[PDB]
Amino acid sequence: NVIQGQLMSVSVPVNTLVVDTLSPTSWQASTFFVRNGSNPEQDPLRNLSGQA
Amino acid sequence: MDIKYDVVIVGSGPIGCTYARELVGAGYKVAMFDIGEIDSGLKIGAHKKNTVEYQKNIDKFVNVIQGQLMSVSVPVNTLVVDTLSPTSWQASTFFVRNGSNPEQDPLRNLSGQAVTRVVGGMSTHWTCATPRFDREQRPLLVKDDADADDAEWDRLYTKAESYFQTGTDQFKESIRHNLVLNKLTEEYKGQRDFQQIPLAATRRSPTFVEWSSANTVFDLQNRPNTDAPEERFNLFPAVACERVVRNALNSEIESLHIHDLISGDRFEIKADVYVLTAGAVHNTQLLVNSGFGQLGRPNPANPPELLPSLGSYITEQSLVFCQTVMSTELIDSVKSDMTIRGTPGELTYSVTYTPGASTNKHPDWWNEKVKNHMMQHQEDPLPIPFEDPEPQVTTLFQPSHPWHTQIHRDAFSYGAVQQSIDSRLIVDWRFFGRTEPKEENKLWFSDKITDAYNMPQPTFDFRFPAGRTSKEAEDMMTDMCVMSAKIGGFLPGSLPQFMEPGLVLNLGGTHRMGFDEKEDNCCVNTDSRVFGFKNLFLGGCGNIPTAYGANPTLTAMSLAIKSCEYIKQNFTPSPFT
Amino acid sequence: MDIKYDVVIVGSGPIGCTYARELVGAGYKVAMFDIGEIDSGLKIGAHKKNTVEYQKNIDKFVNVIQGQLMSVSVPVNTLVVDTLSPTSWQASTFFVRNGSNPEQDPLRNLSGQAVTRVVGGMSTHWTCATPRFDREQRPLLVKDDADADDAEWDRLYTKAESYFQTGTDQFKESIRHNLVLNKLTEEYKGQRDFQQIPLAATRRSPTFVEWSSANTVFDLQNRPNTDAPEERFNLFPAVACERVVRNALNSEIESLHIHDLISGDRFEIKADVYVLTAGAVHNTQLLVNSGFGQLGRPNPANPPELLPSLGSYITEQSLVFCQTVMSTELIDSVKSDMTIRGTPGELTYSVTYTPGASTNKHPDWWNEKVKNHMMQHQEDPLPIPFEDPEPQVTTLFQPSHPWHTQIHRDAFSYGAVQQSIDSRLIVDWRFFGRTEPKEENKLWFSDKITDAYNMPQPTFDFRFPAGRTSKEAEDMMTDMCVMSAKIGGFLPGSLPQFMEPGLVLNLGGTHRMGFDEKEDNCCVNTDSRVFGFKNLFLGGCGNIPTAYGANPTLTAMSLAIKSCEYIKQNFTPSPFT
Amino acid sequence: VDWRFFGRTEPKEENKLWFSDKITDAYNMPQPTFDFRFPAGRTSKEAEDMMTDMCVMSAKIGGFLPGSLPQFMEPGLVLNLGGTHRMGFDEKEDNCCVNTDSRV
Numbered sequence A: 001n002v003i004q005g006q007l008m009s010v011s012v013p014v015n016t017l018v019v020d021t022l023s024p025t026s027w028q029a030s031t032f033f034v035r036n037g038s039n040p041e042q043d044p045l046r047n048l049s050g051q052a
Numbered sequence B, C: 001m002d003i004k005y006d007v008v009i010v011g012s013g014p015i016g017c018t019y020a021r022e023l024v025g026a027g028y029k030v031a032m033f034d035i036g037e038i039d040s041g042l043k044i045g046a047h048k049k050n051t052v053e054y055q056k057n058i059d060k061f062v063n064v065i066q067g068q069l070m071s072v073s074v075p076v077n078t079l080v081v082d083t084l085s086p087t088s089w090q091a092s093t094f095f096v097r098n099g100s101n102p103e104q105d106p107l108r109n110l111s112g113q114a115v116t117r118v119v120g121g122m123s124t125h126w127t128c129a130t131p132r133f134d135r136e137q138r139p140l141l142v143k144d145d146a147d148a149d150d151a152e153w154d155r156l157y158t159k160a161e162s163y164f165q166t167g168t169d170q171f172k173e174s175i176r177h178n179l180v181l182n183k184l185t186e187e188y189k190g191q192r193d194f195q196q197i198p199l200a201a202t203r204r205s206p207t208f209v210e211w212s213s214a215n216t217v218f219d220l221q222n223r224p225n226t227d228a229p230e231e232r233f234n235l236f237p238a239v240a241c242e243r244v245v246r247n248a249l250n251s252e253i254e255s256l257h258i259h260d261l262i263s264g265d266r267f268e269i270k271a272d273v274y275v276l277t278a279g280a281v282h283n284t285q286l287l288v289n290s291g292f293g294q295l296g297r298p299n300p301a302n303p304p305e306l307l308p309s310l311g312s313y314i315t316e317q318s319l320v321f322c323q324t325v326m327s328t329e330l331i332d333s334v335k336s337d338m339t340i341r342g343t344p345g346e347l348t349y350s351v352t353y354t355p356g357a358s359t360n361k362h363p364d365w366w367n368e369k370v371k372n373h374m375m376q377h378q379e380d381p382l383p384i385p386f387e388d389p390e391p392q393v394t395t396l397f398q399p400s401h402p403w404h405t406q407i408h409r410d411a412f413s414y415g416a417v418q419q420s421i422d423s424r425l426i427v428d429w430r431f432f433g434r435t436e437p438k439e440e441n442k443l444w445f446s447d448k449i450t451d452a453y454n455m456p457q458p459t460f461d462f463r464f465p466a467g468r469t470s471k472e473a474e475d476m477m478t479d480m481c482v483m484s485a486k487i488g489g490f491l492p493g494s495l496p497q498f499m500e501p502g503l504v505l506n507l508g509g510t511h512r513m514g515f516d517e518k519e520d521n522c523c524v525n526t527d528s529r530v531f532g533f534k535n536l537f538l539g540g541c542g543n544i545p546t547a548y549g550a551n552p553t554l555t556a557m558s559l560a561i562k563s564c565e566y567i568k569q570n571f572t573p574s575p576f577t
Numbered sequence D: 001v002d003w004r005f006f007g008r009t010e011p012k013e014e015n016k017l018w019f020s021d022k023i024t025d026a027y028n029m030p031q032p033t034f035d036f037r038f039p040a041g042r043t044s045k046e047a048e049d050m051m052t053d054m055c056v057m058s059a060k061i062g063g064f065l066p067g068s069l070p071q072f073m074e075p076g077l078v079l080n081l082g083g084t085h086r087m088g089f090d091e092k093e094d095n096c097c098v099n100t101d102s103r104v
Ligand SMILES: *Cc1cc2c(cc1C)nc1c(=O)[nH]c(=O)nc-1n2C[C@H](O)[C@H](O)[C@H](O)COP(=O)(O)OP(=O)(O)OC[C@H]1O[C@@H](n2cnc3c(N)ncnc32)[C@H](O)[C@@H]1O
Pocket: B010, B011, B012, B013, B014, B015, B016, B033, B034, B035, B036, B065, B116, B117, B118, B119, B120, B121, B122, B123, B125, B126, B127, B128, B129, B130, B239, B240, B241, B242, B277, B278, B279, B280, B282, B283, B286, B505, B539, B540, B541, B551, B552, B553, B554
């Protein structure tokens, strides 16, 4: 836990995971926009995703 | 096979079988085609859970369901796998892989939508809940005369109920059923009514319920035969129906083009009357492949010549689910009338009640069952008999609670932790919302991508409409949370949740019914006849143009019966040759 | 139902059907009973994956398998759920709940062991791998004469292979198949031989393989009929066979006691010859229910009067599994003979080869399929055709690698993340270990707990023996890790693993064969006749007394053929009157 | 017992750490971006050979613990990144940033 708590990811690609079980009243974007500190420059397939 | 029939039916689901029952019985020479195959035993198109093995191992049935539900539209997968060996081959893009549909926006899908290609269709696995729609949910059959409309619907529904063997008595003596029904009756006294879910089913024994199916409606046996020597019916399985051929005037269908999946041969089948009962998705596909509507991505700067409302105004219900573990109060109440003497497992253990006593909270039949269970199984900590049938409780859709409800048990895949909880404690909660028909909600078909049968690939463009539909959906979630708490707390791992869109499989309005094609934005009239066409009829949930929460099959069946009445008045059976 | 037959067979799996084929064909009046029901379509007892829909949606078939595998013995569940609402009822103990078996030590179980109760038994869903055993794995039929023993096996196995339609040719022009086969052949040149897995199956088209089943062996249609006007056979589904009645002398069976599950009535059926082919578990259960062996927990202080070795020396195979993702080198090698000009998607893109070129690594049929795929699907990044069949590769058991191998694809439920990997890249690895027969490894039956059909509850006492069995199992794991690396790296989510004990469903030795009841610690002789009994025969994998890694069904069928030769020489068919 | 085997990776010009001219990190500094694959050839072959070696060697001590089966870890989880500002004798000839005194 000490290790995980001080390793901050270097480059996180834009997340394209579909959540489709939200309530119909919850706000949803129409696209996978740049969210939550993700890096839109990052090709998810040419990354070091574990680099921290 | 002949090239010529009086009536050809595409699909052997319960709606196809309604046409077959009516029209075979009226003396028409009928052929029915199904892309799927016979696989329910000797009773063709029968319910697959009516084997002794599934009556004894109910939850294994969830595997049967899953094994015959094929996803309608799966978007391109973009999940990163970055723990492959450096030696393994990898593409540098998320390419079109594994039957995925590149037309599909993953954020405007019905991901849970699936289809069943077997003889008997989805009626070989369905839950068999067959409520009537109240006026608020129900399509109009007579305009500007509510009593005449009500009378027609009562007539049609009563017949549909007879065809399905719908009843509300099959679980009447279950302890768990009455424990739940009685508690909810009391809690909502003066506010809501509760009853048994109307079920298409016949009880055969204390531990066997024969669930209804396509086979209940029509046995699907070729005719003539010994029981029906004057009737004419052929079923042709493993035949893909690919299109109906329109005349140039768009006033008549000229033939049905079929692909025999075993031989590989293609034919034109000819009939006087063509009936499409291939389900809400595949009726639409067949029509679009026949030149109705528009192939490819919707183009409002270019609406289609024929049936411009086809595949628009599509509806799918919101579904919320949880499971609960019965309260200590309710469990203890089961044995409220008992006098319990001794300690369990010893010779001095006694469990007794006074039959008929006026201070008894339960009937004698209840107390006898509890007494016997408690005395015969003194190791068991619960007063509910081991073979006690499940609850099947509903409060039907009303304006102040505009959702259908099922408070019951069906086949479920319990996780290993969940199996730690005694199944007698567990109750399923399914609440179903109604969805407003909106023009922008669509089912369309690719002009480039094809499905596994080489037919134009179905693609959804769907979101739950803002406004009433969405508000009601969230209100419905809250309602399930409030009501379920009267019975017990949530079962971990089955916490209150919206199900993936389309998982509910109550899709409607893909080929919707109305009085006037233009004014009511519709595809078929109240006889289920395709506008403009003398001899083409559609059957199924796809005809339903309303926002409905209740399960739609009984209503679709009622519409098919009315359709058949028109057919009998307008087409003459061939003389039996 | 008649009261007397020449032969009664309990179970309609492939081994029951071997006795039916032999004995119905020989003119005997045969009855067959199955506790399960007809549910494979019109071809009674046929393979459920032979539908067009399952040939197009192959992975959905895992659901069919799961839906008809009922666990043999589930120990009491001790998993803690401590996040129930305070209002929910809870017991203070992990009491006997949900069909669990309180006799079962969870640490000495075959937890993956399961049974299938349907007409055709497990051959309705099996993988169809039918290798022969080499001498090392094979029970003796002739003592002290290796060449006679070899000759007898070859005869029997050859007939069995005709019954099952076993072949090694059905995947010969698969690119994926030959890609793997060739690579492993080269890697182990001089060390091991590779070939196609022998498969009970007939290819019908490039995209359809008709898998064999019990129906292949014997079609299960009542006789006499038009095709077999002088044969006599009746099949009685939904009949639980409960016991065989022994005479006072324990020299003859006098009747079969049955329970008709539909009517609920019990009857005694008379025959000259009684054959039990109810599977390794249920043969043993029926025997113990009939007074053979010992009911209850095994007890050396009180050994059984009849068949003291029944339910001892049981064997189950170790199974290890992974999946791989094809190496870049192998994928690139697929198109090694192509000259590729231009840019995909454009006018000038060109993929060509020179037919017959002496420098080509691949044959013309291969190069033609690759060329057409690459030219017709220029958006697709892989050279493997979309409809290319799966690999079906083995190196069979040998002393230097004493495990069976399958390097293939069968139906599998892929996770969402695994679905991200193109299916053409994926190969399944299954290695099967042999298990030494040990007296302490037992299948026994409770004298207090009953199963869902009210029969004594099966209980395992099993561990993989120390010594050779365990060392070989671990060596086998390492061998899979080494061999698989030649093809590609492991697929995440399907890393190398031992499967749950008994998930493999290759249980043997429960009613084992040998020459001398006492010396060979066995239950049946080499004619599959129960020792002491003139007219009682057992069929199936339970007869197999050896340590085997290869799939046992073909071997069990070969034993049943030899059994039928005995029966034909010692029992006279009734006159067809 | 834990088993961790660490492969060596050939330095290739195409494997890059670069910085966004538009996106910034939590300290408002140019956002790091990787362009990385394990090089074909020796690096990849040895990585897979390493995997097998772990499988073979570990079997001498015991079988795999369920839930910790032999696997490649997510790229960079190992946290042994090198060569981003690499040393050599001659800036051009050795394609490098610092000399053997670590001087730019
Ligand atoms: C799957 C399911 C469905 C279900 C349910 C629970 C489950 C898990 N619970 C229900 C409930 O409790 N009450 C209710 O009213 N319905 C419930 N359902 C849904 C119900 O099964 C369906 O609404 C009903 O079966 C629809 O009937 P219909 O006859 O219209 O359609 P189908 O059953 O899907 O049959 C269609 C068939 O036609 C075939 N087909 C498809 N395409 C073609 C082509 N091109 N050519 C020839 N035949 C075709 C199919 O193979 C099929 O059999």
